[PDB]
Design an enzyme around this catalytic site. Structure first.
Site, PDB file in Angstrom:
ATOM      1  N   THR A 266       0.842  -1.221   0.000  1.00 22.36           N
ATOM      2  CA  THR A 266       0.000   0.000   0.000  1.00 22.36           C
ATOM      3  C   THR A 266       0.866   1.255   0.000  1.00 22.36           C
ATOM      4  O   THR A 266       0.609   2.157  -0.824  1.00 22.36           O
ATOM      5  CB  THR A 266      -0.934   0.060   1.215  1.00 22.36           C
ATOM      6  N   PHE A 391      -8.763   4.737   3.556  1.00 18.71           N
ATOM      7  CA  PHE A 391      -8.361   3.929   4.732  1.00 18.71           C
ATOM      8  C   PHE A 391      -9.551   3.138   5.309  1.00 18.71           C
ATOM      9  O   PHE A 391      -9.480   2.646   6.475  1.00 18.71           O
ATOM     10  CB  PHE A 391      -7.645   4.829   5.745  1.00 18.71           C
ATOM     11  N   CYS A 398      -8.266   1.370   8.547  1.00 18.03           N
ATOM     12  CA  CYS A 398      -6.808   1.093   8.597  1.00 18.03           C
ATOM     13  C   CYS A 398      -6.220   1.514   9.954  1.00 18.03           C
ATOM     14  O   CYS A 398      -6.184   2.727  10.268  1.00 18.03           O
ATOM     15  CB  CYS A 398      -6.074   1.833   7.492  1.00 18.03           C
TER      16      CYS A 398
END
Ligand code: HEM
Ligand code: BWX
Length: 453
Positions: A266, A391, A398
């Site tokens: 990512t 996110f 996240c």
């Protein structure tokens, strides 16, 4: 209403539409054709793809919808286990790891990781300072070297030394091939054929390599008693305030594999996409470079200096708007419910959120959705709720958001401070899909501004 559905292949329904190198990009093109929602059928599976803020804000209501493991995450689960990323909300080990790890990933915690992040960032800058003239930089390769090494060092005080190798660390080879296997299996009309028997045996060998290196690192830390300020220490000592239990060593392994997947995939994509947009928008590059030079006055950036890189932060948010590197997440209906007052859903019905499409909704962003304007993120409170989700959502968002943006801001900051960048090949964007998105073949030339470290 009779939901749009893309073209079909008899008994296989829509499934062969995913029989491509670029499935996320194919589904984005289906969403452009069909609109804010469409049905996707496969043998024994139905999913509904969401593209509009209108529908996605309802899907992000935690009272009605919970995180679903997509087929991708079910396949990653064979090596990432009941780690935070591949666990169901209702598994005891999800909330337990969440409570233990949350403080380790807060904005406060980043002061702890800072010095280590700098170590790897200085290695990147020194590699580029040492290139001869008319040598070039392979951007996603160098950013992947950096993000992987930063998590290794911050996660369990291990040096992958990616900047000393052409051939990646053995653990990385096994992880990349496991992820490839995991994403490949999505498309296969006949899962358990004999061609796949060979892939199966390779996959089980790759699971073993990762398990063995991580289990050894955990065992060696136990035996040492060293209290390094890394995630491994936090996880060996830490107690969940709820249960009062620590994580067992199996789950600690799964967390560490989980973190190394995130580092690898990512954060390197974000940094690669940001550099791409900067070379393609020189007025925006000049603004970010002016800020880097004014703020990063010391040879070694401090935590405080990184926090004042506002425009670099807006650049990273604008890159995440156009190419969110983890481009989708999946939800299931906790109970029978109606989405948008017009789409009935039965308990257990899946929604896929197509983040790149959410991020192109003209009703939110205006009619210039394809332009790179970091100025959109000038003022955080001006962005509507659930319009920007690189996110993910709520309690299943996240946990690495602060870590990612700190690393990306520090690194992009130092890159704009130390070098001028040339798009010497006039690079045409080519987006490779693994678990994540990366601009494949993105190359530049860096001319040093000759500023000392
Ligand atoms: C630019 C970088 C990153 C992006 C765009 C990103 C994106 C996401 C997304 C979309 C999710 C939700 C997945 C879902 O709902 O199925 C997520 C979850 C997660 N991310 Fe990241 N991530 C990034 C960096 C990182 C880093 C650096 C770490 C760790 C070091 C990390 C660790 C995690 C974990 C553990 C979860 C699971 C959270 C939970 O369910 O408790 N990520 N991330
Ligand atoms: C880390 C995340 C982004 C992994 C991921 C990558 C790509 C996707 C894409 C958007 C997707 O639609 N995946 C679907 C693919 C699918 C396979 C068979 C039948 C129906 C659907 C899924 O994984 O469930 C979803 C998740």
């Amino acid at each position: 209403k009779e939901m749009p559905q893309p073209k079909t292949f008899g008994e296989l329904k829509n499934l062969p539409l995913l029989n491509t190198d670029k499935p996320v990009q194919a589904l984005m093109k289906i969403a452009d054709e069909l609109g804010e929602i469409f049905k996707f059928e496969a043998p024994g599976r139905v999913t509904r793809y969401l593209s509009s803020q209108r529908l996605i804000k309802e899907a992000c209501d935690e009272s009605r919808f919970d995180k679903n493991l997509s087929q991708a995450l079910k396949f990653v689960r064979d090596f990432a286990g009941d780690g935070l990323f591949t666990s169901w909300t209702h598994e005891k080990n999800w909330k337990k790891a969440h409570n233990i790890l949350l403080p380790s990933f807060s904005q406060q915690a980043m002061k702890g990781y800072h010095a280590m992040m700098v170590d790897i960032a200085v290695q990147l800058v020194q590699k580029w300072e040492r290139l001869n003239a008319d040598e070039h930089i392979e951007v996603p390769e160098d950013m992947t070297r950096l993000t992987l090494d930063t998590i290794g060092l911050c996660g369990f005080n291990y040096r992958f030394n990616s900047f000393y190798r052409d051939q990646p660390h053995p653990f990385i080879t096994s992880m990349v091939r496991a992820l490839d296997e995991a994403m490949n299996k999505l498309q296969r009309a006949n899962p358990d054929d004999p061609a796949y028997d060979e892939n199966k045996r390779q996959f089980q060998e790759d699971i073993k390599v990762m398990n063995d290196l991580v289990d050894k690192i955990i065992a060696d830390r136990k035996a040492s008693g060293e209290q390094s300020d890394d995630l491994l220490t936090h996880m060996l000592n830490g107690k969940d305030p709820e249960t009062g239990e620590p994580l067992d060593d199996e789950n600690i392994r799964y967390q560490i594999i989980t973190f190394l997947i995130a580092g690898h995939e990512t954060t390197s994509g974000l940094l690669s996409f940001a550099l791409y947009f900067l070379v393609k928008n020189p007025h925006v590059l000049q603004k970010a470079a002016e800020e880097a030079a004014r703020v990063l006055v010391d040879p070694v950036p401090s935590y405080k200096q990184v926090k004042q890189l506002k425009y670099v932060g807006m650049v990273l948010n604008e890159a995440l708007r156009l190419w969110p590197t983890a481009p989708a997440f999946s939800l299931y209906a906790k109970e029978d419910t109606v989405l948008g007052g017009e789409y009935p859903l039965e308990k257990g019905d899946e929604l896929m959120v197509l983040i790149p499409q959410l991020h192109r909704d003209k009703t939110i962003w205006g009619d210039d959705v394809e332009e790179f304007r970091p100025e959109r993120f000038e003022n955080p409170s001006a962005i509507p709720q659930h319009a920007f989700k690189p996110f993910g959502n709520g309690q299943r968002a996240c946990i690495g958001q602060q870590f990612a943006l700190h690393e990306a801001t520090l690194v992009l900051g130092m890159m704009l401070k130390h070098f001028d960048f040339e798009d010497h090949t006039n690079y045409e964007l080519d987006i490779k899909e693994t678990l994540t998105l990366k601009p494949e073949g993105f190359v530049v030339k860096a001319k040093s501004k000759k500023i000392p470290l």
